[PDB]
Amino acid sequence: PNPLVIERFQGVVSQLFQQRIVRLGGAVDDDMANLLVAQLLYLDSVDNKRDITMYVNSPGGSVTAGMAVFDTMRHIRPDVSTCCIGLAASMGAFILASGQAGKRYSLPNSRIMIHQPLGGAQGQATDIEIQANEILHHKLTLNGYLAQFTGQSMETITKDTDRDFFMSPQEAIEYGLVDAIISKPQMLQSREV
Amino acid sequence: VSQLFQQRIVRLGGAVDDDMANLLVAQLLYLDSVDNKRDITMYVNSPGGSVTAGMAVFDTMRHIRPDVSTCCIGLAASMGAFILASGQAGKRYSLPNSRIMIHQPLGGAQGQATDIEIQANEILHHKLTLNGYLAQFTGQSMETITKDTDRDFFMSPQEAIEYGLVDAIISK
Amino acid sequence: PDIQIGHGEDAIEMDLYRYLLSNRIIFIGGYINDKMATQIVGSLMALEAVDENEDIRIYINSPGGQPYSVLGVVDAMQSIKPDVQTVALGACYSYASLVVAAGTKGKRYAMKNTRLMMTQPMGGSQGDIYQIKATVEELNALYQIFSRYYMKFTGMNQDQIEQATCRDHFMTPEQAKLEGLIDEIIRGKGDYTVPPAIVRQFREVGLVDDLTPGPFLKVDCN
Amino acid sequence: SKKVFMIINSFGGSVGNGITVHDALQFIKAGSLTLALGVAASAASLALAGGTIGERYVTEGCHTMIHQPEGGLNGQASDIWIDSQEIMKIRLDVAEIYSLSTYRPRHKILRDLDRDFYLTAMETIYYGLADEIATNEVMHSIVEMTNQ
Amino acid sequence: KKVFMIINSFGGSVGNGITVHDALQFIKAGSLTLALGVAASAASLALAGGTIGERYVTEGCHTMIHQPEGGLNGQASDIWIDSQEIMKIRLDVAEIYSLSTYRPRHKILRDLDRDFYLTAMETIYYGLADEIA
Amino acid sequence: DRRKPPPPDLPSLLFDQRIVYLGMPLVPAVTELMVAELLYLEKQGATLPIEMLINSSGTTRQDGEILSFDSEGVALTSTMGFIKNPISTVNMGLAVGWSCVVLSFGRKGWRKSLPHSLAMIQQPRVPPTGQRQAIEVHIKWREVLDYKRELLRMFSLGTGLPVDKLDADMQRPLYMRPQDALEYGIIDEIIEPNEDKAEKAAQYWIRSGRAESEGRLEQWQEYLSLQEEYALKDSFRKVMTQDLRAAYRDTSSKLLKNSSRNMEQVQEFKERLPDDMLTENDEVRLPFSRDGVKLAILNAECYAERNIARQVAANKVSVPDKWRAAYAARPAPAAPAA
Amino acid sequence: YPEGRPLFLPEAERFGNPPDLPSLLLQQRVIYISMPFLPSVTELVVAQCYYLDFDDRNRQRPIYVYLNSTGCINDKGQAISADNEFYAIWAALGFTRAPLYTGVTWKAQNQAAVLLSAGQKGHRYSFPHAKISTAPPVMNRVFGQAVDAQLQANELDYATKYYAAILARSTGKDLETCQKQYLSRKRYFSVKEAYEEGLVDKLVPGFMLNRFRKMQK
Amino acid sequence: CRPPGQRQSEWVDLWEAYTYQKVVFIKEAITEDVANNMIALTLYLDSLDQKRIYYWLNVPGGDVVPTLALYDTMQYVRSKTATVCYGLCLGMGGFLLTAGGEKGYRFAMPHSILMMHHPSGASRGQASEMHIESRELVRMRDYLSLLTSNATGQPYDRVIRELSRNKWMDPKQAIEYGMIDKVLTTP
Amino acid sequence: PFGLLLRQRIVFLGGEVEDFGADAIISQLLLLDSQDPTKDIKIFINSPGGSVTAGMGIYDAMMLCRADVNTYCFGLAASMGAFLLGAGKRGKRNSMPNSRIMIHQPLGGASGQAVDIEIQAKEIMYHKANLNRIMADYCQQPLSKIEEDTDRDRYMSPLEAKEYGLIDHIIGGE
Amino acid sequence: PFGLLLRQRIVFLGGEVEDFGADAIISQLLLLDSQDPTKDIKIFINSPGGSVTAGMGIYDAMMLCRADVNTYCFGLAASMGAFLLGAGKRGKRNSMPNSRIMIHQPLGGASGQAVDIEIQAKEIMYHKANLNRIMADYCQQPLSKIEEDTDRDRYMSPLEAKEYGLIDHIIGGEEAVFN
């Protein structure tokens, strides 16, 4: 992108971080997850009590880097309240699910997509078994965690995440992925009737 | 480079081009503006370069006021070698393990019989000018230098001492 | 959308990773190539020069490394004065895996959901018969060095390493703690979920069956 | 010619093709004399073991390498799992075919398909994939059969 | 003695469909047109070009109907001219469909607007085909 | 006989005997050739049969790279419906996707396969649209849906199975060996290998003395020993599981609850008595494991090296140092520690 | 239907010359190996051998094998194919009956040099400026554990001992000697050096230079 | 459109079979290659005898020099020339449609699409090189416009003004404009 | 340059709406919300559009703010500049006199097996219905009319947009 | 962190050694010499090779330094890092217990008219002789043995090298030296 866009965004990122607001944007590769682990550790060191607000806006990401971020969220002292804006999809949705219970939010017009890990197995038959066990372990672990977060059952989750499962935040609340919707009052338009 | 630059060190590194020559010329002119007496030293490590850029660097070296001592580090090859041979007399140094190469100009041409013949005789002009300057710098005659530049002439630093390109070695 | 850093916001406002390194934390991400090994050894020695007695903490989230760079990093870890304390995150894939085992015994940690891995040194033969013999000797020397380091850190037999490295061996923190690669698992706020491999190990000793799988993940579909 | 002579020298090919040629060679009524020149890789080893038992010839300088099916596959976790199970079933099919062609147990065949497995002429005949060294008189007679 | 045209074409430029339709009508002994699987626009024109009474479609076949496509590039007036011809092409295709389906040409233009899919029975009813195999 | 020369090559040689060989991914050229050959073979006579050999990977490479479309198969299958003389379709090697429908679409009772051939069925996929509008995405989905339904209808005519079952099974790759295809409905027969060949092979292995001594006996013994050892180990695992459940029942016979009365209440009036429902709610009974077998003798093994336990009694008040906020957990008459 | 028997030169001289060049050379019992030992060359040479030993009445008419190939190794020294293509060719050329005369046009290298030596004693020809060279066998890059590379080393050592056996039989030397001289390092032979070591035996028959002819005129 | 159609006694390719009847199907945009093939075919067909050569065009465009070479070859041969338009004739194809048989022997199929535009071209170099190329291209525009005007009967100045942009015509507009002479129908 | 205007509470929504760009705009909006609750935020729009998810994310950050969110058009506002332009505070949507405002149904794609196609089509139909409802809510037109207009790319000048309801002021008047 | 180490007279030579990389290191060594002439420098070598020209540039810089220049290899030192590691002051060359040390000739090539081919063969042969001559001097082994060894493609453990004369100390006391 444009360097001036990058510089403006890095400035506003520093301001938000000052206000204890980390953010997870874009595909969650290893680099972003190392960065976000570093930010979470810093915010733990600065203050051990105040909440951290984690901005999730992601279209996907690596299972392994997502779990790096997820363990650091569940290990540090301050409660990481995850808030979804725009799109929490397939690993930002897992991250949004794993925010502090009762403190996961979503703006009204967002989309949550939870599904199972993609991937690929290559090589001789035995290498393909080993790699299929890696992918199936990741799938089972993530479904077990979604069952823990949402209050659903492992089988309902496994049935729901077989293919892409897009959800509005209302359906997410009614599911268990998100706990509240953030919105301000509007003016209810009077109709002539 | 700045860390070297404040030490009056100008690096002619890597094969020369017009951008590298522009950077060298700007450095040399600024450094002459700063101090016209205190010396400039210049590390040479280059496998060649365009003849025109080397000529630009050589003229900028010549007419500025500080002596541009040239110290060869690593290698100096047929256009960085000419630049190395053009440092101030008595101040063309070599490292003990560096190698020095001299060889004729190069370059292509395309166009009509007239245009590519013109490119041919400008290449002859480059060859004549370089041989004349090398004769000025070493002390050998046009014939020995033309024979040397005719075919790839790899040399050791010591030979270059008795063949005139370098003034001394830094074993010190 | 490369990356966007905080600053920590002191009177200087320097880069976040510079701040963390100043507070004695080294992050290892991506392949441990020669530049990464050089940076990690330089960081270890700078932290040693600042204070030779206070703990260094290393976070390892890396998908492997060049074997020689990893051996250099492990040698630097074992040759410095302070306690080195290695926390595994995300993944540590076989060469990085040794980097986790090389922390000060008692201070090797892994996050609850990391994926360690152990593999034979993989290389590759090509060319004349003497180049192929050279490759065989290189890969045998690497196998001996990494096998000896795994023996040194985990206490396993060379036979046990032979079984644990004959093929890509993906391990949870629980196998790693049973084997000796790590010392403590960093859990959540009381998170003790049993991973699928440990459930299978339950099934292999008869603790759970198909009739009574217990409150563990269903691995009846394997 | 009440025999179908099938001359083998091929460095690989998908194992399914080796299975197809093995089944076809075991299906036709007419006999089969399969000769290996130089090499017979996975599918070619299946085609070599597929001939009439007792007429599977291999030269002195031939090599026979048998390896387990290797595949590649991308997609969701369930798709990787299903393709994985299928590739294991193919490995078992190949092990059973070698077991029945050579009379070795499926477990020693499966142990050998663990890694790429090279066999010389004596090693191949001992193992059971071929039955006789191919001396010049063998296809002296083979050419004479095609001519007579 | 009658050209028997088997049609199974997932696509093609519509102008080529017009050209094949003209070639079909050129010969005087009737043409039978049997569609299999799919008959998209450039082949839907060909299917509608057979002899009325002797155009057949198969139970599985689906018919595509759509307006022509085009890319343009040049000055503003070049773009205007090129737009005018693509409109002429679309009007001609609607006219051909009107001749074969005996349906309001404006209605056929409305149906061309976006990609239009017809099952075998809807192909029969629309008028592009006459019978089912 | 001179007047008709020998056929120039192999495809002419086969097609001369009414053998339509479908062996290539079902591309438009292959589909056109198949249609031309089937129409020509009906022309030469609509009572003579056609032997179609299917070693094909459908409309997409096995890699998953889409290479034709979902309508080339519709053309070929509707063609096979159009030609009226009997078609026997033999599966060779691979019959994926539409090439499986074609295998199941031959004359019933004549569909066959080689003993190891694989018949896979999955759901059609399409190449990426390329960021079209919303209505064009809806219209593309309706296109893809109609063609998937066509595939389902033709596969229902082939196998015999409902549309809904086939749709459910198709959602993921479904791999079928000839036993499985014969079960499902794809094929009717399996082309067994020649019997005389197999008999001669067994006789040669016996008579030549190769089957006995080439190293075979030692490792066949090793195979049987490994099988017996692993069967016994699995039996010991089952024994361990059953003893764990027996321990749970030993330590669960000390209970005082009224929830069993509720489980009596919820159940129907007919099952007021314990009366199971012939379903996967199936209670396997361990306690009636009085096998009493006097034949299965314990081998010469010594378990007398196991120590002598303290012989603890559970009728104590001492409790393990745990935490529970419930105070309904009264001490039981047999468990004063509860 | 009828079995169409390929009729050979004694009785096929009445059917004229063949249309193109490769058919001409096949009829002359010349197998011209002009291209590196790829699977295509192996297939073609095996079929030519099968046709030549098919219906020769006397099968004493020798088979000529002219070489213009660097064998199974590319020009830059990295294997372009495997050693099994050579075995298949060599094995095939052995299942015939006729004496196997070999010659070199320009280059017989690394495998074609062995196949050159492997002709009849007294009947190996070369052009007087042919370049012959013997190099150790080369494998192509494969990935794995130390065990895979060890397996490749074993295979390459079988190949090296095979070539050393053929060169020992051809050049009449000690087996390990032939391994040391030829296969140990990539060594070049002029025609005279190759003749000195038994690689070749003669120039092509009738080779007479131009100014030599002039001065005998 | 591959299958060889049977001829007097054997199987001959469809387009060769057509040229055996003097019919020359031009179906590709005129590049150096197709133009050379059609010039060669025209010369040989005139060599066999002199009866007439029908050109069936489906040309969607083409380059200027090869098209003018084909035109000059058509005019050089003794045998007359008629041009029919199956499909469409665009640009230099619409110029070839006005290249054969001025006396009422240009036909078109009912839905054929006709287009004429001033010939394109592109070339750079020195300043004087651009002068020479620009002068030559203006000479080319003028020559092709003279040919178009004398083919259709429209004023030269009218043609210059009309063809500066693209010009598209239905067969009725082409008859009314003089571009063609008759429209083929079922007869 | 731009930062100096951000100091005056002005957000440039320029260039194609993208994931990175929308993330930057949302962060700027949240920060300008935190800095002062009751000072107007001005969003300048010159963009041919972008992803629907990014556009609704920016729309949510716009609606969440406690500050009136003026919108301005400079040149083009196409398919997501237009939706976000009308999504400004009513009575406070301005446009430059010679600027083009295109209304456009959302773009989406689909690839993979028939179930992937069905899921993507269902998602895009949801987005289309949602956007139609929002646009008809702030344009005060029937949902049917919005469906007809968004059917194809409709370009309006600020007069056609002002009568159609997307904007509220034209900065040069007439 | 490298700034503090450069203050401590520690120079890192890591990764592939190249022309620009050499110029940077040469400058660092000259700075450390001109600042302080009595305090030793430490150069750490983890490098898989390099260019002969750049390598000899760094070697000349190392041999100019008045302040004794120790070297400490970690991980790899392949055929040009190993030479520089052998060019530290005698008695002050160190290695990790499990570093891998390689000694080997350079590659090369030439093209076109074979005049330049013979000149390139002569220059590659010069590099061979030059490197081997100084290697023999510091390894304290016969030049014939060094010439033979620099041919053979092989790694060695720091124990083998310490025997061979290249390095002089192993950091770890040969307690973690694994084969």
Coordinates of N, CA, C and O in Angstrom, one line a residue, chain B residues 96-172:
Chain B
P96 N 47.6 -6.2 0.6 CA 48.6 -7.2 0.2 C 48.0 -8.3 -0.6 O 48.8 -9.0 -1.4
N97 N 46.7 -8.6 -0.5 CA 46.1 -9.8 -1.2 C 45.2 -9.4 -2.3 O 44.5 -10.3 -2.9
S98 N 45.1 -8.1 -2.6 CA 44.2 -7.6 -3.7 C 44.8 -7.9 -5.0 O 46.0 -8.1 -5.2
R99 N 43.9 -8.0 -6.0 CA 44.3 -8.3 -7.4 C 43.9 -7.1 -8.3 O 42.9 -6.4 -8.1
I100 N 44.7 -6.9 -9.4 CA 44.5 -5.7 -10.2 C 44.5 -6.2 -11.7 O 45.3 -7.0 -12.1
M101 N 43.4 -5.8 -12.4 CA 43.1 -6.2 -13.8 C 43.1 -5.0 -14.7 O 42.5 -4.0 -14.4
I102 N 43.7 -5.2 -15.9 CA 43.4 -4.2 -16.9 C 43.1 -4.9 -18.2 O 43.6 -5.9 -18.6
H103 N 42.1 -4.3 -18.9 CA 41.6 -4.8 -20.2 C 40.8 -3.7 -20.9 O 40.4 -2.7 -20.3
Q104 N 40.5 -4.0 -22.2 CA 40.0 -3.0 -23.1 C 38.5 -2.7 -22.8 O 37.8 -3.4 -22.1
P105 N 38.0 -1.6 -23.4 CA 36.6 -1.2 -23.2 C 35.7 -2.2 -23.8 O 36.1 -3.1 -24.6
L106 N 34.4 -2.0 -23.5 CA 33.3 -2.9 -23.9 C 32.1 -2.1 -24.2 O 32.0 -1.0 -23.8
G107 N 31.1 -2.8 -24.9 CA 29.9 -2.1 -25.2 C 29.3 -2.6 -26.5 O 30.1 -3.0 -27.4
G108 N 28.0 -2.4 -26.7 CA 27.4 -2.9 -27.9 C 27.0 -1.7 -28.7 O 27.2 -0.5 -28.4
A109 N 26.4 -2.0 -29.9 CA 25.9 -1.0 -30.8 C 24.9 -1.6 -31.8 O 24.9 -2.8 -32.1
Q110 N 24.0 -0.7 -32.2 CA 22.9 -1.1 -33.2 C 22.6 0.1 -34.0 O 22.6 1.2 -33.6
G111 N 22.2 -0.2 -35.3 CA 21.8 0.9 -36.2 C 22.4 0.6 -37.6 O 22.9 -0.5 -37.9
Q112 N 22.4 1.7 -38.4 CA 22.8 1.6 -39.8 C 24.4 1.4 -39.8 O 25.0 1.4 -38.7
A113 N 24.9 1.2 -41.0 CA 26.3 1.1 -41.1 C 27.0 2.4 -40.6 O 28.0 2.3 -39.8
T114 N 26.4 3.5 -40.8 CA 27.0 4.8 -40.3 C 27.0 4.9 -38.8 O 28.0 5.1 -38.2
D115 N 25.9 4.6 -38.2 CA 25.7 4.8 -36.8 C 26.6 3.8 -36.0 O 27.3 4.2 -35.0
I116 N 26.7 2.6 -36.4 CA 27.5 1.6 -35.6 C 28.9 1.8 -36.0 O 29.8 1.4 -35.1
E117 N 29.3 2.3 -37.1 CA 30.7 2.7 -37.4 C 31.0 3.9 -36.5 O 32.2 3.9 -36.0
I118 N 30.1 4.8 -36.2 CA 30.4 5.9 -35.3 C 30.6 5.3 -33.9 O 31.5 5.8 -33.1
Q119 N 29.8 4.4 -33.5 CA 30.0 3.7 -32.2 C 31.3 3.0 -32.1 O 32.0 3.1 -31.1
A120 N 31.7 2.4 -33.2 CA 33.0 1.8 -33.3 C 34.2 2.8 -33.1 O 35.1 2.5 -32.4
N121 N 34.1 3.9 -33.8 CA 35.3 4.8 -33.6 C 35.2 5.6 -32.3 O 36.2 6.1 -31.8
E122 N 34.0 5.7 -31.7 CA 34.0 6.2 -30.3 C 34.7 5.2 -29.3 O 35.3 5.6 -28.4
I123 N 34.5 3.9 -29.6 CA 35.1 2.9 -28.7 C 36.6 3.0 -29.0 O 37.4 2.9 -28.0
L124 N 37.1 3.2 -30.2 CA 38.5 3.5 -30.5 C 38.9 4.8 -29.7 O 40.1 4.8 -29.2
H125 N 38.1 5.8 -29.6 CA 38.5 7.0 -28.9 C 38.7 6.7 -27.4 O 39.6 7.2 -26.8
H126 N 37.8 5.9 -26.8 CA 37.9 5.5 -25.4 C 39.2 4.8 -25.2 O 40.0 5.0 -24.3
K127 N 39.5 3.8 -26.1 CA 40.7 3.1 -26.0 C 42.0 3.9 -26.1 O 42.9 3.8 -25.3
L128 N 42.0 4.9 -27.0 CA 43.2 5.8 -27.1 C 43.3 6.6 -25.9 O 44.4 6.8 -25.4
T129 N 42.2 7.2 -25.4 CA 42.3 8.1 -24.2 C 42.8 7.3 -23.0 O 43.6 7.8 -22.2
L130 N 42.2 6.1 -22.8 CA 42.6 5.3 -21.7 C 44.1 4.9 -21.7 O 44.8 5.0 -20.7
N131 N 44.6 4.5 -22.9 CA 46.0 4.2 -23.0 C 46.9 5.4 -22.8 O 47.9 5.3 -22.1
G132 N 46.5 6.6 -23.3 CA 47.3 7.8 -23.0 C 47.4 8.1 -21.5 O 48.4 8.4 -21.0
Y133 N 46.2 8.0 -20.9 CA 46.2 8.3 -19.4 C 47.0 7.3 -18.6 O 47.7 7.6 -17.7
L134 N 46.9 6.0 -19.0 CA 47.6 5.0 -18.3 C 49.1 5.2 -18.5 O 49.9 4.9 -17.6
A135 N 49.5 5.6 -19.7 CA 50.9 5.9 -20.0 C 51.4 7.1 -19.1 O 52.5 7.1 -18.6
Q136 N 50.5 8.1 -18.9 CA 50.8 9.1 -18.0 C 51.0 8.6 -16.6 O 51.9 9.1 -15.8
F137 N 50.2 7.7 -16.1 CA 50.1 7.3 -14.7 C 51.2 6.2 -14.4 O 51.7 6.3 -13.2
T138 N 51.5 5.3 -15.3 CA 52.5 4.3 -14.9 C 53.9 4.7 -15.3 O 54.8 4.5 -14.5
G139 N 54.1 5.3 -16.4 CA 55.5 5.5 -17.0 C 55.9 4.6 -18.1 O 56.9 4.9 -18.8
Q140 N 55.1 3.5 -18.3 CA 55.4 2.7 -19.5 C 54.9 3.3 -20.7 O 54.1 4.2 -20.7
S141 N 55.4 2.8 -21.9 CA 55.1 3.5 -23.2 C 53.8 3.0 -23.7 O 53.2 2.1 -23.2
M142 N 53.3 3.7 -24.7 CA 52.0 3.4 -25.3 C 51.9 1.9 -25.8 O 50.9 1.3 -25.7
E143 N 53.1 1.4 -26.2 CA 53.1 0.1 -26.8 C 52.9 -1.0 -25.8 O 52.1 -1.9 -25.9
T144 N 53.7 -0.9 -24.7 CA 53.5 -1.9 -23.6 C 52.1 -1.8 -23.0 O 51.5 -2.9 -22.7
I145 N 51.6 -0.6 -22.8 CA 50.3 -0.5 -22.2 C 49.2 -1.0 -23.1 O 48.2 -1.6 -22.7
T146 N 49.4 -0.7 -24.4 CA 48.4 -1.2 -25.4 C 48.4 -2.7 -25.4 O 47.3 -3.4 -25.5
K147 N 49.6 -3.4 -25.4 CA 49.7 -4.8 -25.3 C 49.0 -5.3 -24.1 O 48.3 -6.4 -24.1
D148 N 49.2 -4.7 -22.9 CA 48.7 -5.1 -21.7 C 47.2 -5.0 -21.7 O 46.5 -6.0 -21.3
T149 N 46.6 -3.9 -22.1 CA 45.2 -3.7 -22.1 C 44.5 -4.5 -23.2 O 43.3 -4.8 -23.1
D150 N 45.3 -5.0 -24.2 CA 44.7 -5.8 -25.3 C 44.0 -7.0 -24.8 O 42.9 -7.4 -25.2
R151 N 44.7 -7.8 -23.9 CA 44.2 -9.0 -23.4 C 44.1 -9.0 -21.9 O 44.8 -8.2 -21.2
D152 N 43.2 -9.7 -21.3 CA 43.0 -9.7 -19.9 C 44.3 -9.8 -19.1 O 44.9 -10.9 -19.2
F153 N 44.7 -8.7 -18.4 CA 46.0 -8.7 -17.7 C 45.8 -8.8 -16.2 O 45.7 -7.7 -15.6
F154 N 45.7 -10.0 -15.6 CA 45.6 -10.0 -14.1 C 47.0 -9.8 -13.5 O 48.0 -10.4 -14.1
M155 N 47.1 -9.1 -12.4 CA 48.4 -8.8 -11.8 C 48.3 -8.9 -10.3 O 47.2 -8.8 -9.8
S156 N 49.5 -9.0 -9.7 CA 49.5 -9.1 -8.2 C 49.8 -7.7 -7.7 O 50.3 -6.9 -8.5
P157 N 49.6 -7.3 -6.4 CA 49.9 -5.9 -6.0 C 51.4 -5.5 -6.2 O 51.7 -4.4 -6.6
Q158 N 52.3 -6.5 -5.9 CA 53.7 -6.1 -6.0 C 54.1 -5.8 -7.5 O 54.7 -4.8 -7.7
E159 N 53.6 -6.7 -8.4 CA 53.9 -6.4 -9.8 C 53.4 -5.0 -10.2 O 54.1 -4.2 -10.8
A160 N 52.2 -4.6 -9.7 CA 51.7 -3.3 -9.9 C 52.6 -2.2 -9.3 O 52.6 -1.1 -9.8
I161 N 53.3 -2.6 -8.2 CA 54.2 -1.6 -7.7 C 55.3 -1.4 -8.7 O 55.6 -0.2 -9.1
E162 N 55.9 -2.5 -9.3 CA 57.0 -2.2 -10.2 C 56.4 -1.9 -11.6 O 57.2 -1.6 -12.5
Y163 N 55.1 -2.1 -11.8 CA 54.5 -1.7 -13.1 C 53.8 -0.4 -13.0 O 53.2 0.1 -14.0
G164 N 53.8 0.3 -11.8 CA 53.5 1.7 -11.7 C 52.1 2.0 -11.3 O 51.8 3.1 -10.9
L165 N 51.1 1.0 -11.3 CA 49.8 1.4 -10.9 C 49.7 1.8 -9.4 O 49.0 2.7 -9.0
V166 N 50.4 1.1 -8.5 CA 50.3 1.3 -7.1 C 51.6 1.9 -6.6 O 52.7 1.8 -7.2
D167 N 51.6 2.6 -5.5 CA 52.7 3.3 -4.9 C 53.3 2.5 -3.8 O 54.5 2.6 -3.5
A168 N 52.5 1.7 -3.0 CA 52.9 1.0 -1.9 C 51.9 -0.1 -1.6 O 50.9 -0.2 -2.2
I169 N 52.2 -0.9 -0.5 CA 51.2 -1.8 0.0 C 51.0 -1.5 1.5 O 51.9 -1.0 2.1
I170 N 49.8 -1.7 1.9 CA 49.5 -1.6 3.4 C 49.7 -3.0 4.0 O 48.8 -3.6 4.4
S171 N 51.0 -3.3 4.2 CA 51.4 -4.3 5.3 C 51.6 -3.6 6.6 O 51.8 -4.3 7.6
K172 N 51.6 -2.3 6.6 CA 51.9 -1.5 7.8 C 50.9 -1.7 8.9 O 51.0 -2.6 9.7

